[PDB]
């Protein structure tokens, strides 16, 4: 059990495919859904959770392995999302005005970020690679940046007059900022109501699954404007009600969990 190390693995091509770990992973794992308040609002039923649980019970998932966790709105969810389960599903409504925020949410939860803190009053920060971004959470973040030159002086901005800084956010609950990698930036931030963290995007999180409910696929996880990929756990649906959506999820929960895979870290 050599943890903290990475060793060469080996195998063969003559070994046969083993049994189906389904009907056991459901029992020794847990499934957490994240629905919006609009769903329960439209529904207007108190026993819909027990109903979906008794339905899951047919697919194999036992009674107390399923969890439902409401969220009033996509931004309130983006505010410190704490996903601690063994299989997470996230039903996400589409709004053309919220596109960037509901893509930042995806880039935050679908992936696994290694996040170090940040202190703006003392230091001036720079990015090193293309995956070392700055994610800001809080209730209203107003972020301004002033890049510096080789000799610690601004570029189109002054290091005293914060009004001359360059604005990238304006009262956003979640922000993910990428800047030019190789230049030191001086920052202004609403530290009182927002925390900023310098995070490196590691390999992806195979434990969550986003399901867009409405419009066409728009989520550009990769900040670089060349890939625009569609990952396997990035699902779309077209909706007019919510019971049909929940029945679809329950009937196709095995494909979802096949698209997902228990975490590594």
């Amino acid at each position: 059990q050599n943890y903290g190390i990475n060793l060469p693995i080996t195998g063969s091509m003559d070994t046969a495919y083993a049994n189906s770990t389904q009907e056991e992973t459901f029992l020794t794992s847990t499934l957490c859904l994240y629905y919006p308040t609009e769903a329960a609002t439209e529904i207007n039923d108190n026993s819909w959770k027990d109903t979906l649980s008794q339905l899951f019970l047919t697919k194999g998932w036992p009674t107390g392995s399923v969890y439902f966790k409401e969220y009033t709105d996509i931004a309130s969810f983006s505010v410190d999302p704490q996903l601690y389960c063994d299989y997470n599903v996230v039903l996400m409504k589409y709004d053309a005005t919220l596109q960037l925020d509901m893509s930042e949410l995806a880039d935050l939860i679908l992936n696994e970020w290694l996040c170090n803190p940040m202190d703006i009053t003392l230091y001036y920060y720079q990015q090193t690679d293309e995956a070392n971004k700055w994610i800001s959470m809080g209730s209203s973040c107003t972020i301004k940046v002033c890049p510096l030159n080789t000799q610690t002086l601004g570029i189109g901005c002054l290091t005293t007059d914060t009004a001359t800084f360059e604005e990238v956010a304006t009262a956003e609950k979640l922000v993910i900022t990428d800047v030019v990698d190789g230049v030191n930036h001086k920052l202004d931030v609403t530290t009182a109501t927002c925390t900023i963290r310098n995070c490196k995007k590691l390999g992806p999180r195979e434990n969550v699954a986003v399901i867009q409910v409405g419009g066409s696929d728009v989520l550009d996880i990769t900040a670089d404007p060349t890939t625009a990929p569609q990952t396997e756990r990035m699902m779309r649906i077209n909706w007019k009600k919510w019971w049909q959506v929940f029945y679809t999820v329950v009937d196709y929960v095995n494909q979802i969990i096949q698209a997902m895979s228990k975490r590594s870290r």
Binding site: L153, L158, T160, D161, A163
Partner: protein, 48 residues
């Protein structure tokens, strides 16, 4: 009025002794004003 004269119940401030013993008449309040004051904030200073 002026006793011993026909000038009675006239309305107005007579300029004989307007102060009436008081050191000064005072009025308090606030007031806001717009101006075109100069500033740079903070340009035109040396580059360093």
């Amino acid at each position: 009025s002026i006793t011993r004269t026909r000038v009675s119940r006239l309305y107005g401030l007579p300029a004989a002794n307007p102060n009436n013993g008081k050191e000064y008449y005072e009025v308090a309040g606030r007031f806001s004003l717009i101006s075109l004051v100069p500033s740079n904030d903070d340009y035109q200073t040396p580059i360093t």
